[PDB]
Design a protein around this ligand. Structure first.
Ligand SMILES: C/C=C1/C=[N+]2CCc3c([nH]c4ccccc34)[C@@](COC(C)=O)(C(=O)OC)[C@H]1CC2
Ligand SMILES: C/C=C1/C=[N+]2CCc3c([nH]c4ccccc34)[C@@](COC(C)=O)(C(=O)OC)[C@H]1CC2
Ligand SMILES: [Zn+2]
Ligand SMILES: [Zn+2]
Lengths: 358, 358
């Protein structure tokens, strides 16, 4: 039984029946604190589109009962004997992944988010063979390598979506030189990831055009996020006028979409960075890719050193997500609103104040 | 009429009926020598898979009668007054493209193969509005910028496929750093482009594995081409054993094929360089691309300065294609054999000795 699996009792909300996707109160347990482990009392957990996709029963490989949530901000309540960088009582945050092989090139050179055996935030076995439970819970236990120090100047609630959506945008931009004034960057899709991509790029001095299928989002894009331009992707005149005008485009969409129009927007040798995870596959336009010498680049989150650097950057530049703070028993309705796009732009669950045992 | 369109008479073989793809003798004409033009008596024309794709009526944009062939080696018989770099009687070669806009960034910085208005080797209008006729003809006229000096020590017949297949492999490797010892390179498909990619990589000192669906090519791959290894892609054990072992893969296939297994062969941050142009669309597996931080990169031919550089490299390192020299009236049978992969590895038409007027 989940409550007997481990010595320390824990509780949260879980999808017990994968065919319905409904979360309900859930008792379970967490491993004892190892020598390099940190126990974290969870304060806030951001909700991302991957949580929704999991809840919609679209990831076969996940094990149920499923406790989702991978944007965790909390307080260290207990550290192992070998832990030194983090002290009890400190504000901390958890990476979007929980472990790596430790031996491959990526791990040894601190690029460990790209470990072939990276352990994702929930739903799969840990090193001890037990299924991981995510951030919609009262406490978690994480190896110290994957725990970050949360800046004092940063809102815990507004900073929580930085741990998956924020780092994905930040790393993709930093890794591919999309963080310098003079760059014209396009951001496709204005959801959680996209709205943070705009904020980070403005902080970098990058000129940003939001590329959207929702014309009512223009005002939010320009007035609230500070984008330099808004491109309605169904406007053939707007699209043709922007041909060859982008150095790079960051694609955040979780649905199937045509890639060829996006490649046409890029100048020769431009980059299309894919950070969204459509559940269905995409079609590759070979001729536009070849004739333009263009690149399709995948990116996923960021390494833990890059994540700490991002958190410090966000604190100094006051970069937070635009959030709605919700109680945990609102989670099923929030999932519906997230499915309809009725959120600007992130749900964050107040775990400390609204979660109680079953 | 094609013979009256221009002042100078010419002849070759053309697809007159695009629905059959059958070539037959064809009379036409070519423009007078402009100030910057070079008239070229064609000696040899390599046959590439794009010629086959054109004769199979798979490129809607091409105009007919269609004279294909874009791997031309010849002799300069006449130069414009302003031409200085090439003298009459010199052995020359033609780039796989015939013109560019001349104004964009790529043109002015000698990256003109990626000009958005590049004029391909045949079947589309030239600057004067007339359809271009390719290398399956007795002579051609080319602006001097797109004419190369052919090394004396290089076989004209064996060197002819360097002008499209050779430059595509060479440029893709040079542009993305796949030309240095220490790199483990995969070459998918052992056709015209693939077999030249192996030869160039061996000359660079790169370790090369040939990835093929035809096990009977193993001996030529290892003994004749000098590949370090041969991977049968339908052997699931062999494929699983090579997971994460490739720094980069060059995909030369002209047919639709699964790309996710190739992404699995790459290490994290690896590159899949696409140089083949399948007529039907390919499927992009986002999750493998996202998981590894991997790249899909398109590349097309090379710029003319790089082409001259490639030709000189081939002369000093004795790089030629493995060819069957054929007479022009064999072209329809050669297309059938090329369609079936029954050639090791390139057809080259002997134009000077076997082409006669209708
Ligand atoms: C930052 C979160 C995203 C979410 N999606 C879908 C794939 C995915 C990831 N975690 C998940 C948890 C539950 C269900 C699906 C996923 C993740 C985690 O990032 C890592 C491990 O470094 C990934 O890479 O899975 C290997 C990335 C990639 C894009
Ligand atoms: C060099 C190898 C060809 C073959 N294919 C198919 C596309 C193609 C090209 N020429 C053609 C002629 C007749 C029919 C189709 C084509 C070309 C030429 O390269 C250039 C202009 O620089 C290209 O890029 O077309 C923009 C490349 C790209 C890959
Ligand atoms: Zn590893
Ligand atoms: Zn140009």
């Amino acid at each position: 039984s989940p409550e007997e699996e481990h010595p320390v009792k824990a509780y949260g909300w879980a999808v017990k029946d994968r065919t319905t996707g409904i979360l309900s109160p859930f008792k379970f347990s967490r491993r004892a604190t190892g020598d390099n482990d940190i126990r974290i009392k969870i304060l806030y957990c951001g909700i991302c589109h991957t949580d929704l996709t999991s809840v919609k029963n679209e990831y076969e490989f996940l094990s149920y009962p499923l406790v989702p949530g991978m944007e965790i901000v909390g307080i260290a309540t207990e550290v192992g004997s070998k832990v030194t960088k983090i002290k009890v009582g400190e504000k901390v945050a958890v990476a979007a992944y929980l472990g790596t092989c430790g031996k491959c090139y990526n791990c040894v050179n601190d690029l460990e988010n790209y470990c072939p055996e990276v352990i994702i935030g929930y739903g799969t076995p840990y090193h001890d063979g037990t299924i991981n439970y995510g951030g919609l819970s009262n406490e978690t236990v994480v190896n110290e390598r994957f725990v970050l120090r949360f800046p004092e100047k940063l809102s815990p609630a507004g900073g929580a979506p930085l741990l998956s959506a924020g780092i994905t945008a930040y790393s993709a931009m930093r890794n591919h030189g999309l963080d310098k004034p003079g760059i014209h960057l396009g951001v496709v899709g204005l959801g959680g990831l996209g709205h943070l991509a705009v904020k980070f790029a403005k902080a970098f001095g990058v000129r940003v055009t939001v590329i959207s299928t929702t014309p009512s989002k223009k005002d939010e894009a320009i007035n609230n996020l500070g984008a330099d331009a808004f491109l309605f992707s169904r406007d053939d005149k707007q699209m043709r006028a922007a041909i060859g005008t982008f150095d790079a485009i960051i694609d955040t969409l979780a649905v199937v979409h045509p890639i060829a129009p996006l490649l046409d927007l890029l100048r020769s040798h431009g980059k299309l960075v894919l950070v969204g995870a459509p559940s269905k596959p995409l079609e590759l336009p070979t001729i536009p890719l070849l004739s333009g010498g263009k690149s399709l680049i995948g990116s996923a989150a960021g390494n833990v050193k890059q994540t700490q650097e991002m958190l410090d950057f966000a604190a100094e530049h006051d970069i937070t997500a635009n959030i709605e703070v919700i109680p945990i028993d609102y989670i099923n309705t929030a999932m519906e609103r997230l499915d309809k796009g009725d959120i600007r732009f992130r749900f964050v669950v107040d775990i400390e104040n609204t979660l109680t045992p079953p």
